[PDB]
Structure 1
């Protein structure tokens, strides 16, 4: 009894409005989105096996109109296949509209639209950084807990045509086999240490060789050599991750063996960064589409 197209229509309706309008769905509609997307998440692998062509996006953090711009320029589903790398909520003004549109497209196009878990798709984090406050203000506490149950079933990583490894954070010193990811059962929370934690929290670092301590106080940093060894062992060409704001929306690491994507331009009004999307064609030739305010 989920009127998906009505929901999507109302979400897209506010395109090009100024001042930026909210989209206030009903409580039951949002719960319907959570319940149906949760089922699909669980029915699909926790380690996604995807095929190009597709477009890959980094953090959104509730910057809803920027998400609309991404679709406007990259092509609204199902014109293009999409993989998002997480951190949909918190900090921005419109986490609800953001995650609702994403869940809606997941339900609408379950084989052409994919969402990974970021470290903010976690109750202990998004209780603090804005999403819970937004849920409490615009709906109720119970709805936030419904989101949490949904978030606990998000897939953790994706491999594109057996060559591009995708996750929110990065590598883990505990990651020896891809089966270790496949063995993770859902629903699950994000632990404060271990494989699942690292995949959502770790960062590359140009000044560390192997594994180092992360300034975040969580997980690790990893160096160029770690990336090289990982790619060789698993016969991969590229690591695609997000989790860090970069000035041009994308940023290479270790001679293009790793790329960081960040899709929220002028991040929470504090940075002058561009947002980027990585376009991967059928042959895995990768390029970038860059979202930037005019000056």
Structure 2
């Protein structure tokens, strides 16, 4: 009964009820992670999606703001969704956030899509909150079942052959799209390599194409890297998240790249959600900080 689990999750979300225990039992959480993992593995590491679709950035366990997104932008399945990752850590309701997204994935496998962020891995959840949230509100076995599910999340999506969607950004070794298709799953996230770069890198107005990233891992890529990447693969836009931006979204390099960040008041930033029409027109819907 996936419908009842959604209604229970949305009930807690509509009311703002804040409890130590999750509204779903650990046995129900286990079955959700199992069904979603199987669905993720049956679909490619590189998704190919057709418009219309709305693209959501970092949520980071801000479950109330996920409810605001669905209430304003439309609940599934009448709105097709692509999430760019970073569902857990920092927010006090990471469990409700990832559980609702996984349930929608189970119910609408071909109309609801979730990419991997750099926070959907074992080591980052141990440092930034979601490990402790699982230990306090559920158990370590439940946390391991989430990591097993995270390790199957796809890595990038291409919308109408023209919009490349990834959580972090580009890579000096992204030489073909099949290198993303052939990323074996399940997998952890290494400290280095194409997979690490796709989830960790950031754009900048730097003098050099590639420089080490101030976050302590991966790279920052320049406008030249974007131009060469869009030209080589015949894309019009790079759509990514990963980086908090004051106005919810921010174009970069003559609107060849956009950052979509969907966690309002993360540090007092707006949140934004990008809509892609059938004719590949990009518009946005805003989420105020308070």
Q: Deviations over 1:8-59 (max 9, x none)?
A: 0011112443565674210111111100000000000100000000000000
Off by >4 Å, runs of 4+ in structure 1? 18-23
Question: Deviation at 1:79?
Answer: 1.6
Pair 1:246-2:242 in alignment: no
User: What is the match of residue 145 of structure 2?
Assistant: 146
User: What is the match of residue 79 of structure 1?
Assistant: 78
Q: Deviations over 1:188-222 (max 9, x none)?
A: 00010010000000000112431111001100000
* Pairs aligned (count): 289
User: What is the match of residue 13 of structure 1?
Assistant: 11
- After TM superposition, list the pairs within 5 Å mapping 1:207-218 onto structure 2: 207-218=206-217
User: What is the match of residue 118 of structure 1?
Assistant: 117
Q: Deviations over 1:70-124 (max 9, x none)?
A: 0000000012000000000000000000000000000000000000000000001
Within 2, Cα distance between the matches of 1:84 and 1:209? 30
User: What is the match of residue 289 of structure 1?
Assistant: 285
Question: Paired residue for 1:278, among 274, 277, 283?
Answer: 274
Q: Structure 1's 274 and 20: CA in aligned 2 closer, same or farther, altered over 3 A?
A: farther
Q: Structure 1's 8 and 282: CA in aligned 2 closer, same or farther, altered over 3 A?
A: same
User: What is the match of residue 205 of structure 1?
Assistant: 204
State whether residues 16 and 64 of structure 2, in contact with CA within 8 Å, keep that contact through their aligned partners in structure 1: no
Q: Structure 1's 80 and 35: CA in aligned 2 closer, same or farther, altered over 3 A?
A: same
User: What is the match of residue 58 of structure 2?
Assistant: 59
State whether residues 7 and 25 of structure 1, in contact with CA within 8 Å, keep that contact through their aligned partners in structure 2: yes
State whether residues 14 and 21 of structure 1, in contact with CA within 8 Å, keep that contact through their aligned partners in structure 2: no
Q: Any gaps of 5 or more consecutive residues in structure 2?
A: none
Within 1, Cα distance between the matches of 2:262 and 2:55? 9
User: What is the match of residue 31 of structure 2?
Assistant: 32
Within 2, Cα distance between the matches of 1:91 and 1:45? 29
State whether residues 90 and 131 of structure 1, in contact with CA within 8 Å, keep that contact through their aligned partners in structure 2: yes
Q: TM-score, normalised by structure 1?
A: 0.96
Query: What do you get for the CA RMSD once the two structures are aligned?
Result: 1.1
State whether residues 55 and 81 of structure 2, in contact with CA within 8 Å, keep that contact through their aligned partners in structure 1: yes
Within 2, Cα distance between the matches of 1:125 and 1:208? 30
State whether residues 208 and 221 of structure 1, in contact with CA within 8 Å, keep that contact through their aligned partners in structure 2: no
User: What is the match of residue 228 of structure 1?
Assistant: 227
Q: Any gaps of 5 or more consecutive residues in structure 1?
A: none
Question: Deviation at 1:157?
Answer: 0.2
Q: Deviations over 1:241-289 (max 9, x none)?
A: 000000011011111000001001111xx3x100000000101100110
